[PDB]
C-alpha cells in the first residue's frame, strides 16, 4: 500500500521527462511554478556570483513557464550576517523557514542601487525593504561553492502537509505539539537563567553490558527508569514478545 | 635558571636542594605570559619561595669590577 502511495503520490514524476524535478517537487502538493514566491539568493556580494546566480535563477523560471509579470522575490541575507563559507546554506535555510511561517519577506537593506545589468532578468525582483505579505508558499535556497559545488533546495510551507492526513489524526497531533511547546518554554527559560541549556550526557541509554543486545534488537526502545527517572534500555524490553 | 638560583640564594638564602623546591613550586604557578621587568621576575621568585616556605614549613661592589671585566 505504501509503495502504491509512493508510485502515485510521492514519486509520480521520477520516471517522467516532461516533469522537471523542480516542477514535480512543487506539483506533489498541488503547487505550480508560480507558487515559488521567494528565492533566497546566495548573494555573495561578489560581481561574479550575483550576476550568474540571477541569470541561472532567471532561466530556471523562464524554462518552466513562470508567468510573465510574476518575478521571484529575492532575499540576500549575507548583507546582514556576512558569508561564513560552510554555514551559509543553513542560515538561509533558517531564514527561509522563518519567512514561510511569518509571511514576511525581509528586504536587502543594503541595496542602494540594483545593478543595471540585472534588469534583463525580468523574473527576479530585488527588494530594498521588508514586505509583509498575506502568505509565502515556497522558498528556494540556492548556494554556490568553490570546485563547481552547486546546490538548490526547495522548502514548502508546513500547512500543505496537514492536507494529507485525517482530521482526527491532525487534531491528535495539535494536542501533543501544544503540550511540548509548554514544556519546552519551561525548559528554555530554565537553561537561559541558570546556564543549564547544554547538559552533557554522562552515560549512554544502555549499560556497557547491554550495549550489544540493543544494537542487535531493532525493536529495543527506551523507557523511564524507576530509580533514576531518566531514559534507559531495560532488560525486559530487549528481544521481547511484547 | 642560573641567575634565578643566585637570586634565590643571595636574597632568600637557599642551598642546592631548597632552591629545587622553589623552582618546582614556580612550575605549578607558571606565568601565562613572559614577565617583563627583571624586577617583575625577582618579585615572582619572592612569592614562590614563600609558598615553598609554608609547604615545607621554614621561615625567612664586586659588581663594579664585574661591569668593567665585561668591557675587557
Amino acid at each position: 500500500l505504501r509503495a502504491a502511495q509512493q508510485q502515485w503520490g510521492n514519486d509520480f514524476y521520477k520516471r517522467d521527462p516532461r516533469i522537471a524535478p523542480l516542477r514535480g517537487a512543487l506539483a506533489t502538493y498541488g503547487l505550480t511554478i508560480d507558487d515559488l514566491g521567494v528565492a533566497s539568493f546566495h548573494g555573495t556580494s561578489t560581481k561574479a556570483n550575483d550576476k550568474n546566480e540571477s541569470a541561472t535563477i532567471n532561466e530556471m523560471m523562464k524554462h518552466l513557464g513562470r508567468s510573465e509579470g510574476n518575478p521571484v522575490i529575492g532575499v540576500f541575507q549575507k548583507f546582514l550576517t556576512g558569508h561564513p563559507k560552510g554555514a551559509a546554506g543553513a542560515w538561509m535555510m533558517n531564514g527561509a523557514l522563518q519567512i514561510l511561517n511569518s509571511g514576511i519577506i525581509p528586504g536587502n537593506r543594503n541595496a542602494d542601487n540594483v545593478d543595471k545589468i540585472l534588469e534583463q532578468f525580468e523574473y527576479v525582483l530585488y527588494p530594498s525593504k521588508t514586505l509583509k505579505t498575506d502568505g509565502v508558499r515556497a522558498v528556494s535556497i540556492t548556494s554556490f561553492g568553490f570546485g563547481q559545488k552547486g546546490g538548490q533546495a526547495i522548502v514548502v510551507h508546513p500547512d500543505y502537509l496537514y492536507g494529507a492526513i485525517t482530521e482526527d489524526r491532525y487534531n491528535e497531533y495539535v494536542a501533543k505539539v501544544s503540550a511540548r511547546e509548554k514544556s519546552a518554554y519551561k525548559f528554555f527559560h530554565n537553561g537561559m537563567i541558570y546556564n543549564k541549556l547544554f547538559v552533557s550526557k554522562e552515560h549512554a541509554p544502555y549499560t556497557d553490558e547491554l550495549e550489544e543486545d540493543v544494537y542487535l534488537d531493532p525493536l529495543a526502545r527506551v523507557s523511564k527508569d524507576k530509580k533514576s527517572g531518566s531514559l534507559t534500555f531495560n532488560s525486559k524490553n530487549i528481544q521481547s514478545k511484547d | 635558571i642560573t641567575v634565578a638560583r643566585k637570586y634565590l640564594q643571595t636574597r632568600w638564602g637557599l642551598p642546592s636542594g631548597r632552591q629545587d623546591g622553589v623552582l618546582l613550586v614556580a612550575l605549578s604557578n607558571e606565568p601565562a605570559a613572559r614577565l617583563g621587568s627583571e624586577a617583575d621576575a625577582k618579585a615572582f621568585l619572592d612569592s614562590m619561595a614563600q609558598k615553598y616556605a609554608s609547604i615545607v614549613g621554614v621561615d625567612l661592589l664586586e659588581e663594579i669590577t664585574k661591569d668593567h671585566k665585561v668591557l675587557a
Binding site: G69, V114, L125 | -
Partner: protein
C-alpha cells in the same frame, strides 16, 4: 570649519527606478490588502502618481499579473486592491511614453496653537478649513487679503472621499478657460 569634505570616490548615484517601481506597487498592494491604506487615504493617490511616473511595458505586465490574479472573493479588502489595481493598470497604459510629473496631493495644512487649562502650550498642524487641493491654494494666493490694498473655479474632487475615483482622474489634462490670474 573650512576643512575639505568632498571626494569623488564618496559619491553615490541612484539609478534603478525600473526596479523600485515594481516594489513601490507590490507594496501599495499588500498595504491595501492589509488595510493600512483604506480607499480614503490620500496616500493611495500619491503612490498612484509615482507608479504612473514609471510606466514600463514591464511594469504593466507586473501589475497585470498581480492584479488579475487577486481573488476579489477573499474579502472586502481584496476587491479594493483589484479595482484600484485595474484602474492603475489602465492609467499606466496611457502614461506609457509620457514624461513623469511632480504633483503634490498632500492635504494642505495651517498653524494651530492651543494653551491648556493648565498652561500646557500645544501646537498642531490642522487642515485649512477652506483649502483642500493645491489648486485651491493657488486661488487663495491670487486673491490676497484685505491687508494688500494699494498696488505698487469649482472642479469637485473625489479627494478624501474615494481615492480610486481620483486615481482614475490623474492621467487627464485639465482644461481651463477661467485663468486664475483673472481672479
Amino acid at each position: 570649519g573650512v576643512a575639505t569634505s568632498f571626494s569623488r570616490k564618496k559619491a553615490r548615484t541612484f539609478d534603478s527606478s525600473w526596479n523600485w517601481a515594481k516594489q513601490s506597487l507590490l507594496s501599495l498592494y499588500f498595504e491595501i490588502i492589509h488595510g493600512v491604506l483604506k480607499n480614503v487615504d490620500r496616500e493611495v493617490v500619491s503612490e498612484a502618481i509615482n507608479i504612473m511616473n514609471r510606466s514600463n511595458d514591464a511594469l504593466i505586465k507586473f501589475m497585470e499579473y498581480h492584479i488579475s490574479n487577486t481573488d476579489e472573493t477573499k474579502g472586502e479588502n481584496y476587491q479594493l486592491v483589484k479595482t484600484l489595481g485595474e484602474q492603475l493598470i489602465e492609467n499606466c497604459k496611457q502614461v506609457l511614453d509620457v514624461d513623469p510629473v511632480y504633483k503634490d496631493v498632500a492635504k494642505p495644512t495651517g498653524p494651530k496653537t492651543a494653551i491648556d487649562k493648565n498652561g500646557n502650550i500645544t501646537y498642531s498642524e490642522e487642515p485649512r478649513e477652506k483649502v483642500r487641493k493645491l489648486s485651491q491654494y493657488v486661488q487663495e494666493m491670487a486673491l490676497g487679503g484685505p491687508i494688500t490694498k494699494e498696488s505698487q473655479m469649482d472642479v469637485e474632487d473625489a479627494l478624501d472621499k474615494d481615492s480610486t475615483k481620483e486615481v482614475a482622474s490623474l492621467p487627464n489634462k485639465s482644461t481651463i478657460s477661467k485663468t486664475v490670474s483673472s481672479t
